[model samples]
Target: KLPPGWEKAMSRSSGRVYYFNHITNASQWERPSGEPARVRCSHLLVKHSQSRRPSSWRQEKITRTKEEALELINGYIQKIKSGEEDFESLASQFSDCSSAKARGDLGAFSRGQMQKPFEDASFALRTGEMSGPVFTDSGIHIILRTE
Candidate 1:
């Protein structure tokens, strides 16, 4: 049975059942087996000078040190978990990825679509759950799994 807060919808593309959670504002196609077929997540990325590109659409010239970047990422996490900020709005305002264009929403992705560490963190979370800091070549990230 669907949970209390989930609202049922239908997808035009595949004609599959779509589940949207009013509590978390998240969506999913269906419930998972041991390994889910697809998952969706949002992340807030902060890049330091050591990252592969070290630059994002938000900043034309990235010049922050690794320590500085980590501190900033941690700060965001604190505000998010402390009920002082909203993930979507925070991502819109501060996430470094181009995904910030969509308020940090990464949409749906399969296993191979993302970096291993990034993918791992998202995969580990249950719907509407959030992860602590994760490190990848792109930078440090805080993940919020929507599905």
Candidate 2:
């Protein structure tokens, strides 16, 4: 039997069963003989001008083209790879998320906590690795998976 809110999702790549929770937005693999529990990740985000949403009742402009957004995020990726700057500093300075105040630390979040593409890229990362720009309904992101 499974806990409340946990539903089974077959892993097409692995031929295994995992649990997903819609309420909490968490996804997990069943333990394998004492395997560690799913871990959370912290990442930095940089939202281009177009990514902002001003609540349905209000209105706002979507300024940057998707191309422009992609270009800008790639530049950050390069800087990260070249050691020109660090993730936390850049996030605090540039990210649009409220978490930006905390250096874009989304704190720790499980897989389903994010959009599918974002979650997939995040979980695929090893600690200290930077992800290429990932797209979410919210915006483009450059992630550093900090466990």
Candidate 3:
């Protein structure tokens, strides 16, 4: 079954079921790429070994450590906040979700696409400020305000 808060939606591109939060529109897809819909929230990372390994080898290994994942995420966050590169590039390079294919676009999600703690911290971010450290069942996350 899908996450509790998820509702099936009709995708514009494909008829395959796309889960969205039609009831509340709670978790919005926030991309720094300047997409039409503006959403906000925290971000996490793929595990270090997995992120660094060759894509051909990565599929055979399981990268699941939160510390390792956070290290990878923090690396990108550091570069972005320090003005090394724009956030979108980091998202494209580091994010694990399919949105990384579109430079960290989560499309649209509701309460359950995210774990409870993640949902709370993401919603708590202010319009222009980023949070330091937030933990969820997924991993430690840093929230960058996309607005």
Candidate 4:
């Protein structure tokens, strides 16, 4: 049975019935129980310039050396600290993630959603605070913890 003003649809891929709330514009998979405590962050990525490809025809993996990547992140930090630049703009211009389109907003996430190291750094930050670059398997990240 469906609730008032709610609709149910079957998933094409999984063959599951999903419920949607028309009034609140909520879906079954959408976060429920009101807003969850979470953190949001924006980041910039500087890939290693050393990664080489023999030919453009084959796919290549991007790589970055720790020292070089840290250097680039430090430059951005200087600018940010001096108020010469803001996180959002820098992230939009330099972030490798598709979230760069939204000024690098990774959206709100609770604990355990991110990798252990990233999650640790993120949770340690106070709202509206910025952190130095952190390294993960993917690459380095300059995180700005936003509420």
Candidate 5:
């Protein structure tokens, strides 16, 4: 859920649509052994064709659903698997990065800026299109055509 009144304002936001999903775990402690077990995950999907900034890069389409994300990522990976040019622009359209303004422009990022799994998977892409259901502490990700 949003921060109280935030949801109301967002619902009225025109020219932009935002989707948010949250996952939470409840305490499982029966007496004390179980204690409290909890896990929360949030996914946001935005639909916008044009970027606010002319130079900003943003995703054309993105879905957090495992199957959908994987499907899109895996399909693009085929072009790379067949040996295609390292198409950064094509891949950038699908990424959910704020720097997406720069077209998947991660900007100069240090290793610590990213989680190990994300870092490892990102670096592993051999130019061109790449397909994956890379698993990280956060969740499963499939990046299509990682530049």
Candidate 6:
């Protein structure tokens, strides 16, 4: 059953139940949880010229076009997916962020601490699952949920 003052309805697109709160004008796709949600995630970030901060430890000037960034990240995703290279090693070498130094480990994080796209992608993954390229202002990311 839903919480008091909340209503549930099916979505026409996803055909999933969505919740609305008449009392607070709130809405969500999931059942409300009293405990603040947190997750452990690691990600390989590949910055393009359009990134908000385009420079990284690997390069002072990032000039890759968005198309090129997608190609590069997609290649890495295939490598990780096929087991040619594991996530940590690939991330350490290719992820263009300070987290690369720690094998792209972002550790545990709660919602609102990360960019919307990244946080949403991370929260969607279950333990030991990975995601396709997720775009954020920082860069394109291949997300892995470690917890």
TM for every model, in the order presented, reads 0.75, 0.64, 0.52, 0.63, 0.40, 0.76
The best candidate by lDDT is 6
Q: For residues 25-77, what per-residue lDDT tens digits would candidate 6 score against the true structure?
A: 33457775432389998999999999999999999999999899989988998
Clashes of each: 0, 0, 0, 0, 6, 0
User: In candidate 2, which residue ranges exceed 4 Å CA deviation?
Assistant: 1-37, 48-62
Model 4 / residue 108 / CA error / Å: 0.5
lDDT of each: 0.81, 0.63, 0.50, 0.64, 0.37, 0.82
State the lDDT at 56 in candidate 3: 22
Write the residue-wise lDDT of candidate 2 on 1-147 in tens digits: 554345789999998988664433345576312111344555555444556462221123546666886787777767866789887887777665667677777766775667887777666655655566777777777777677
What global local distance difference test value does model 1 have?
A: 0.81
> What value of lDDT does candidate 4 attain over all alpha carbons?
0.64
By the TM-score metric, which is better: model 5 or model 6?
6
**Model 1, stretches more than 4 Å misplaced?**
1-34
Give residue 25's error in model 3 in angstroms. 24
Tens digit per residue, CA lDDT, model 5, 20-90: 21111111112111011211111111222232221223423432455554455555555545566343554
Give the TM-score comparing model 6 with the true structure, all chains together.
0.76
Alpha carbon RMSD to native, model 6: 7.9
- Residues 25-129 of candidate 4: C-alpha lDDT, one tens digit per residue: 234533223123788876665555342321111124545566876787888888887899988888878766667788878888888788665676676655775
Please tell me which model should have the higher TM-score, number 2 or number 6: 6
| RMSD per model, one decimal | 12.1, 9.7, 14.8, 16.9, 16.0, 7.9
Q: After superposition, how far is residue 135 of candidate 3 from its true place, in Å?
A: 2.7
Tens digits of per-residue lDDT for model 1, 22-66? 443345666632369899999889888988897888888789998
True-vs-predicted CA distance for residue 106, candidate 6, Å: 0.6
Q: How many backbone collisions does model 4 have? A: 0
Per-residue alpha-carbon lDDT of candidate 3 for residues 13-121, written as tens digits (9 for 90 to 100)? 6555554432222232232211223345435335334334413222456456656666666676677768997766766665554455665544444455666655554
